[PDB]
Symmetry: C3
Subunit: 268 residues, 3 copies
């Protein structure tokens, strides 16, 4: 009925009545799909996969064996509310990845964008927000309410503490504990993680203009290397966004203005 006739579902799998399976979807054996799951066109699901909850999965995703998507979260305040997982298009979700449903107190939604790679045993906790083209290496873990920007790389066996915000194009080294906000374009390394410079080797593969590197490093220099306080290093970078009007300096500025709304602070 609600299963598209072009979908290929292995007979051994259990598809709960009410699940929406799009065109050209493939589902392997020994899967369990909940009655509120929606799976977009072209998505490929291997064997031994569990998908439940109010979960929306987009187009052309690949979900490998022993993955768990949309499951009850690990927050002790969750009370069975119809919270959601929302996954975009063309994501790679490897073996034993866990993506838990959100909480009402945290915004109701755990959200993942497009073109992401979640390696083996990646955990995405309740109410996380992952942008586009991110990579979380093996055993990576995001705490509750964690926000990732675009083109973020989380190294292997690294954890981001709850509520922390990771700016776009950040690289977190392997075996690193992130306990504060990480401004965009910077390398985070250590336990707890500290700024290790800019992600220059990564920004160059993205195709950044040479004099856009200098504008970004100026904001990094003002924030970390000029010996100024948070508010004073924030006034200067915000002034550069209006005088020189560099799109990356404004992004680097927008992050610090949003991090000022909370008592987390930034890594230093």
């Amino acid at each position: 009925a609600m299963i598209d006739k072009s979908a290929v579902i292995h007979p051994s799998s259990i598809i709960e009545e009410g699940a929406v399976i799009g065109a050209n979807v493939r589902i392997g054996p020994f899967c369990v799909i909940g009655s509120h799951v929606e799976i977009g066109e072209g998505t490929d699901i291997k064997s031994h996969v569990v998908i439940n909850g109010h979960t929306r999965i987009g187009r052309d995703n690949q979900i490998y064996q022993f993955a768990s998507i949309g499951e009850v979260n690990q927050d002790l305040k969750y009370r069975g509310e119809p919270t959601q997982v929302i996954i975009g298009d063309r994501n790679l979700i490897r073996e034993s990845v866990t993506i838990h449903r959100g909480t009402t107190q945290g915004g109701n939604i755990t959200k993942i964008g497009n073109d992401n790679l979640l390696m083996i045993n990646t955990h995405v906790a309740h109410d996380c927000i992952i942008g586009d083209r991110c990579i979380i290496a093996n055993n990576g873990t995001l705490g509750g309410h964690v926000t990732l920007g675009d083109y973020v790389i989380i190294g292997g066996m690294s954890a981001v503490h709850q509520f922390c915000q990771i700016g776009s194009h950040v690289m977190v080294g392997g075996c690193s504990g992130v306990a504060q906000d990480v401004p965009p374009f910077v390398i985070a390394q250590g336990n707890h993680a500290t700024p290790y410079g800019l992600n220059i080797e990564g920004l160059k593969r993205r195709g950044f203009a040479k004099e856009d590197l200098h504008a970004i490093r100026n904001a990094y220099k003002i924030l970390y290397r000029n010996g100024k306080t948070l508010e004073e290093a924030r006034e200067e970078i915000a002034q550069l966004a209006a005088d020189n009007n560099n799109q990356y300096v404004k992004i680097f500025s927008d992050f610090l203005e949003n991090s000022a709304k909370s008592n987390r602070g930034i890594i230093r």
Copy 2:
């Protein structure tokens, strides 16, 4: 015969003859339950769960997908003896948790008390002892013969080496390696882990009176921050428990006396 009438087992799951299944038990699809397994009343077991060995599971437990309970341990000295896993009541056992059976050389039993939370990918090795109301965050690992007191918190991606004793109300930070014994009420962080004062945030969360806090803190000053040796600190703390009859100073000295029977020592 041994399966209660009110239990609901999914027809795809495999239950060997001899498995004792209590009332109001729910077993999801694609499970394997061994012939020497006992499931207490009200326990909920999701899909894709493996439970074998001589395993006793109490009441109102929740065991999520891809968990393994009672399986052959990773000790090379084990030779197939009918050793046991014992799990208490109201435990939350999340995805991909492994709980292995004991060894005859270690005491024959891997034991877990009540009201514990074992997060995703938690490992409990052979002959471990876990008390009540403990929390092991994602990827936490207990080596063989490890003992956890009550209300212990092990941070994410942390490891307790074999035979080590973790006192009650201890908080182990994330990505920390515990190599020696941790006295009760203490925060331990690092690899190898070192003490960082009292777990004041946990104690005030559990309704500790202000007099009990200053009593425990004084016992901490005697142990670490007074220059007195381990033998001298044990003498004074034992004299405090006998004179003042404080229930938590007693727990503090008792741990030190039991740790004195071994050569590991305490963290410092």
Copy 3:
């Protein structure tokens, strides 16, 4: 039919036409075995195991539940070529281990020898080579193209960066990140991992004579404890193996010469 008649396969498992299964093989329920898999005599495969790709498994292996062997690797330059996994005899492959197929760019093969122990959640990436009698503790991770000699120990929650070479009889401590090559017989620990003398307990457990220990201790001092550059020590170490003809100094020397053909260097 290439399934041997003495093999015992649970009817719920999916054995695709083309899989070759030797005599006395046992396969538990809910397994998926691909059409290009070969399984050798006496090998025990528990439940919920996925084995696919062009994968040859030797004799008397023990593969536990939720393991994945031969799956598409995480290298984003891979393009579905028929690459291989080769696993030797008498290996212990614990729960949720992942072993990925090779890449055409890196030698086409992921290879594992005999008598190895891969503990829970071990990851063996594409094109890795593991020798004999190695132990990888819980949550250990080998990046792409990593080589392990014989009798190697990787501590729990430790990661070996891609292309790095680990010499024989090395013990990598728990929660360590190996970013360069590790000469044989060396204890490596830290993040990044640095050398801390010889694996004396490992060598003595394997019956190393004291004359062998003194020669290895002597080769260690030349490389690390005499201020000699890499070119100097490598030439002097190669002179010791030619003169004294100590079989372990030669292994020590051969590793340094093979590592010199690359630019990763050695830990220090």
